């Protein structure tokens, strides 16, 4: 699944960029902290899963 | 070379080393925003 | 009289010289004066 590997990797790259901006903004805006802390919790786990996914898929394309 | 699987990312890899200096410059953008209080 | 924040004009101005100087260092390696 070559295309599927680069899809997970691009997914990981896009998610990183989103959270590179989102996490500091969410952290310093105390108005909507409760609304946001769930999203950083989600994105964080979504992020770790993508590393593992790309990590195992690498061994089927490399 | 990167392993051929990651080749589409060569241009992104080429620019990652400069990101640490951007943090230094970002501190100054930030201090200007707060007016160097 | 202050409608554009000063830190914004600073950053944009700073990024603009960064580009011009970067271009000058690029040209050190290409075309005239690259020794090639």
């Amino acid at each position: 699944m070559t295309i599927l590997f680069q899809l997970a990797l691009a997914a990981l790259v896009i998610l990183s960029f989103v959270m590179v901006i989102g996490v500091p903004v969410a952290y310093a805006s105390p108005q909507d902290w409760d609304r946001s802390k769930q999203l950083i919790f989600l994105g964080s786990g979504l992020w770790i899963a993508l590393v593992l996914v790309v990590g195992v898929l690498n061994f089927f394309v490399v | 070379k990167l392993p051929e699987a990651y080749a589409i990312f060569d241009p992104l890899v080429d620019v990652l080393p400069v990101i640490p200096v951007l943090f230094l410059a970002l501190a100054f953008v930030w201090q200007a925003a707060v007016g160097f209080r | 009289g202050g409608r554009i924040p000063l830190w914004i004009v600073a950053t944009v101005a700073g990024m603009g010289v960064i580009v011009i100087v970067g271009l000058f260092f690029y040209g050190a390696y290409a075309g005239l004066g690259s020794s090639l």
């Binding site: 960029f17 901006i21 500091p24 310093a28 | 241009p11 080429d14 970002l26 953008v29 | 830190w7 950053t11």
Partner: peptide, 30 residues
Amino acid sequence: EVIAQLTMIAMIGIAGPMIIFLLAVRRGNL
């Protein structure tokens, strides 16, 4: 090619000022 590198570094580069810009619109904890 090189535009590929330049669009990457342009987007990475604007990411920094954007966090400041957003926290300053939202009147965040700068």
